[PDB]
Design a protein around this ligand. Structure first.
Ligand SMILES: COC(=O)COC(=O)N[C@]12CC[C@H](CC1)[C@H]1C(=O)N(c3ccc(N)cc3)C(=O)[C@H]12
Lengths: 218, 214
């Protein structure tokens, strides 16, 4: 069967620069009938793939001219000259010259942009949840770059470990930033043992860690 | 316009059967291939097979011989994928994609249908407001303790899309998912504009709407 190999797995690239994704089949993709059936798709996060390039070098309808396919035989390139924020996603090549059609492993294209500080918001647990018997405290870091961020929780000024979770969005398709939530989950009983609830953020954008807090019953 | 609209998410027990539908519109149904592609959480796409509406004929990749069938309802321009004897390795997102045979490509895809194979019963989420306090204020819904993925979240019946982040679901030691959806908004509209998040978790038939106030 037909291995297709994409490189790189992840391609970091700056706005306005050129991105090159390479794709390489175990055997030649030229059909006995003259044609090379190598295609490119793009999948943005949560979304179904979108048809991008067909037969090596032809853009599909509605596809920006800045996308460009090339190569022959066993090796192919997709070029995204002058990159835009909305170009973010996973790029797949696909051969259908030989039965059965295959897809390469995909290349995730990441944008690089200037550092950008988070906005931090804290959320007490609600009454409705408190009366359901648990307490979740939510800390939100909105629109930041780069991704890596240190979020510590402090409860009455004691450092917490291993009782919170983080979730991170995909890079935003307009401004390429990330957002993150840290959630402290406690039982309503542990919760009422303390008054102060604080999340302290450390990030490349901020010159000093930012702390966002509240005392219970506010 | 070519549209490929597929049936909603499923939860199934190991060994059961699932039929997934993909309703096609906007073109002569019988003149293009119907292809099915499997995608596992975090994985490359895999071509399962296709069926040829014109001949009724099906063709499968090696890995998908045996437990997999494709059906057609020509009159209703609907294609199906049935999987028998479900295993955990079938837990995935499945896409139908139209085959434009003139250049042998998949030009239009469905939105995907996610199928979780689990021994566990479903569990609808509890939904709690994340409330704004004190020119830009944040506010949200906490969608707590559900199984399986996914939930759909929208704000104000979809009429508010800007400044909204629905986070990836995370698992807790309990075996269940939780996520938050937040939005940022002008802190001046807090006392005019009313904000409702709409949470939908089909595998348990939970459809909640939750007012988020100060
Ligand atoms: C040896 O080969 C085999 O065992 C079975 O081969 C396949 O099923 N090939 C494929 C190739 C691309 C795509 C997916 C798979 C389908 C397609 O569009 N055509 C196609 C080709 C030619 C005309 N005229 C119309 C339709 C196919 O045959 C299907």
């Amino acid at each position: 069967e037909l291995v297709m190999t994409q490189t790189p797995l992840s391609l970091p690239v700056s706005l306005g620069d050129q991105a090159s994704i390479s794709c390489r089949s175990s055997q030649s993709l030229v059909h006995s009938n003259g044609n090379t059936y190598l295609h490119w798709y793009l999948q943005k996060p949560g979304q179904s793939p979108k048809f991008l390039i067909y037969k090596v070098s032809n853009r599909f309808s509605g596809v920006p001219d800045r996308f460009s396919g090339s190569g022959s035989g066993t090796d192919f390139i997709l070029k995204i000259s002058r990159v835009e924020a909305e170009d973010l996603g996973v790029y797949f090549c696909s051969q259908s010259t030989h039965f059965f059609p295959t897809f390469g492993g995909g290349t995730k294209l990441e944008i690089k942009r200037t550092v950008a500080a988070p906005s931090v918001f804290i959320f007490p647990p609600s009454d409705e949840q408190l009366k359901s018997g648990t307490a979740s405290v939510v800390c939100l870091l909105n629109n930041f770059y780069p991704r890596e961020a240190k979020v510590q929780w402090k409860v009455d000024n004691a450092l917490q470990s291993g009782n919170s979770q983080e979730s991170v969005t995909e890079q935003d398709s307009k401004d390429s930033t990330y957002s993150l939530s840290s959630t402290l989950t406690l039982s309503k009983a542990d919760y009422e043992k303390h008054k102060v609830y604080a999340c302290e953020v450390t990030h490349q954008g901020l010159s000093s860690p930012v702390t966002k807090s509240f005392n219970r019953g506010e | 316009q070519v549209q490929l609209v597929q049936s909603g998410p499923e939860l199934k027990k190991p060994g059961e059967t699932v039929k997934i539908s993909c309703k096609a519109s906007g073109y002569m149904f019988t003149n293009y291939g119907m292809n099915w592609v499997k995608q596992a959480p975090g994985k490359a796409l895999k071509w399962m097979g296709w069926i040829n509406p014109y001949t009724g004929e099906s063709t499968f990749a090696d890995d998908f011989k045996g437990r997999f069938a494709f059906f057609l309802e020509t009159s209703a321009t609907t294609a199906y994928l049935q999987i028998n004897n479900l295993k955990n390795e079938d837990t995935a997102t499945y896409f139908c994609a139209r085959g434009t045979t003139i250049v042998r490509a998949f030009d239009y895809w469905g939105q995907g249908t996610s199928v979780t194979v689990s021994s566990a019963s479903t569990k609808g989420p509890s939904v709690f407001p994340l409330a704004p306090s004190s020119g830009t204020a944040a506010l949200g819904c906490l969608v707590k303790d559900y199984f399986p993925e996914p939930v759909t979240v929208s704000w104000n019946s979809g009429a508010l899309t800007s400044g909204v982040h629905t986070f990836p679901a995370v698992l807790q030691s309990s075996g269940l998912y939780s996520l938050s959806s937040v939005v940022t908004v002008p802190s001046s509209s807090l006392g005019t504009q009313t904000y409702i998040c709409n949470v939908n978790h089909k595998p348990s038939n939970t459809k909640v709407d939750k007012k988020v106030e100060p």
